[model samples]
Target: AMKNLFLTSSFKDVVPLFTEFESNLQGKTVTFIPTASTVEEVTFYVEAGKKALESLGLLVEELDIATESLGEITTKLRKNDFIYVTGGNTFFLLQELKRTGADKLILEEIAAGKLYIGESAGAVITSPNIAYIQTMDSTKKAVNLTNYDALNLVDFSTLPHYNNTPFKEITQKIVTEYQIYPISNHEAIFIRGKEVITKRLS
Candidate 1:
């Protein structure tokens, strides 16, 4: 089994990417992580995304890392066949990963050939570091992020919402030390092991 994956800016339009990531979705369990989002965040994907995935023969369940323990998270993840991380605050997501060791558990799952699907902030958190995200000036300074690191599941960093995001004037001007993928709102990436393919979904 390969660690097939899909990373996107929006889960609203996944049709163009779904077939590219997982060849088959039957008899699979999906653990969705929406912890980065606030409780009140109107879920654009909750109904649509879950319903869409469920139609693919996947049993969907939301995993709240903001409150769940590492042991519980590990157990839930172990029984799941695929994991989908929803969008929201990048800082908050990375913090939770570091705080709960969820990042390590995710890596283990990927190594075990589990599918990983990420959207928006979730996509950025898999990169080398979130310095690319910081340049957007979208992150709230009040979050008081102590360490600005990522899971490093992917080698390069991504500056999501490149042309359409709020940071047009503040577009990522990263240093040569970092590799970056500046993506637009309609773009996504599909990865399997070390192979990477860029996808366009409008």
Candidate 2:
């Protein structure tokens, strides 16, 4: 089974735990996809994402889905064994993935043993639905999304920053029909195949 981390906000939150995860990926290529932010915010998230992976001693190849052709995107994804999706607007990321048809490819690659690291909005995308994110991410920021469908990689929805924001309550109200993983910024989740392996936060 393949293992991946869908973390809260930053990797710094759980470096010790991540070291264990990193030990499993000893020598693997990583494709960094930080397209959730706009053109202006992209650099910040990209640099931060690169830094996070570098901390685990991995080199990163950036894949800007917004500007790349689907063929180009597929080539890179096939070569890389690890994918890290940084944070920004959840809706924006989904839109770009759908527009480029990268969404299906991503699902395929991960199922084939590629490890996927998701943060903030990136974590939300793996859920069965993303509608609950309206309380945290603005649809207006997404600017071009028409499809409300989420990746459905995971059957449960994640409500991040629950302890610091109004998100926990909003999740209770907005995601009443689905299973939820209410998490604080300092926590994270590790998934093995379709099964979620939750740990007690230190």
TM-scores of all models? Answer: 0.85, 0.85
Candidate 2: which pairs clash?
none
Across 55-109, the per-residue lDDT of candidate 2 in tens digits comes to: 6768788898999988889999999878888778889899999988998888888
Q: For candidate 1, lDDT tens digit of each residue in 61-102?
A: 889888988888999899888889887777878878787888
Model 2 residue 29 distance off true place after TM-score fit, in angstroms:
1.9
- Model 1 misplacement above 4 A: 1-3, 39-43, 135-145, 165-178
Q: After superposition, how far is residue 136 of candidate 2 from its true place, in Å?
A: 0.9
Give the C-alpha miss distance for residue 161 in model 1, angstroms.
2.0
lDDT score for residue 172 of model 2? 61
Q: Score candidate 2 by TM-score against the native.
A: 0.85
Which runs of model 2 end up more than 4 angstroms from their true locations?
1-5, 24-27, 39-46, 165-178
Q: In model 1, what is the error at residue 72, expressed in angstroms?
A: 1.7
